[PDB]
């Protein structure tokens, strides 16, 4: 016989506990109404050297947001890096259809993002299909809290984001958008964990058209997650840990995948 440890009961990793506290705060203690909780792969940039952030640690570590580290986060990657992940997720997609597996879901969206002005300036995003031009979403999204994880052994760093995405009334058809861009979205879903592989194309009157390549992992079932968090605040914290552990483990898998 073999036991996990001298207690023979599983224990929560330090990182999982901290992130769980972070989520419990904005789900329960200071609740966000229309909350979205996603993590994006990117690069942690040092504002001085303008290169990737450098830190004398040797493992995935959460940065304390109360300190001023002179840092910014770039949610982007090379098209080659994007294609590598796209092939990996596809293989993972196909494998999950095999017997005895909990299968993936797939959803490929091709949309148009149109940004409008408001009165008290201060953004309205209207998403639409490129095909039939039918409205997909009309929101006012505000960033609430950020939490960065420096990951020295990998090519990417992680930014867990909490946002408030408020559904708003459509702008009048006689006011012009301040910005217009295209967005290709390849969504994989596994156990209600949304893995979106996005590509953002933006025109310019002067400069060459740019393409931003992103990857986002997010909780697809906020209502159920909220329930798990409420239990955690009341002692029963195992279901929340299990859920956050899954989220992070999917993120870590994708973060290590590089040519």
């Amino acid at each position: 016989k073999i036991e996990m440890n001298f207690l023979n009961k599983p224990i929560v990793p330090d990182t999982t506990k901290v992130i769980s506290n972070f989520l419990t705060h904005y789900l329960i203690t200071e609740p966000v109404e229309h909350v979205e909780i996603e993590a994006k792969l990117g690069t942690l940039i040092d504002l001085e050297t303008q290169n990737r952030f450098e830190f004398p640690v040797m493992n995935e570590t959460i940065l304390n947001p109360e300190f001023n580290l002179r840092t910014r986060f770039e949610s982007d990657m090379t098209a080659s890096e994007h294609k590598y992940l796209n092939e990996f997720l596809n293989q993972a997609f196909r494998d999950s259809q095999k017997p005895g597996r909990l299968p993936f879901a797939y959803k490929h969206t091709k949309q148009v993002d149109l940004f409008y002005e408001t009165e008290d300036n201060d953004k309205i995003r209207v998403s639409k299909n490129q095909s039939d031009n039918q409205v997909l979403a009309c929101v006012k999204k505000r960033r609430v809290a950020d939490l960065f994880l420096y990951c020295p052994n990998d090519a990417f760093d992680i930014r867990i984001s909490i946002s408030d995405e408020l559904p708003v009334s459509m702008p009048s058809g006689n006011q012009q958008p301040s910005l217009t861009r295209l967005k290709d979205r390849v969504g994989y879903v596994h156990q209600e964990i949304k893995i979106d592989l996005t590509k953002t194309t933006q025109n310019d009157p002067v400069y060459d058209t740019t393409e931003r390549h992103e990857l986002e992992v997010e909780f697809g079932n906020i209502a159920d997650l909220r329930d798990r968090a409420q239990k955690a605040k009341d002692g029963m914290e195992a279901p929340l840990f299990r859920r956050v552990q899954l989220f992070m483990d999917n993120v870590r898998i994708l973060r290590r995948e590089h040519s």
Partner: peptide, 6 residues
């Protein structure tokens, strides 16, 4: 220092 939620 430590954030409020931790």
């Amino acid at each position: 220092r430590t954030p409020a939620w931790n």
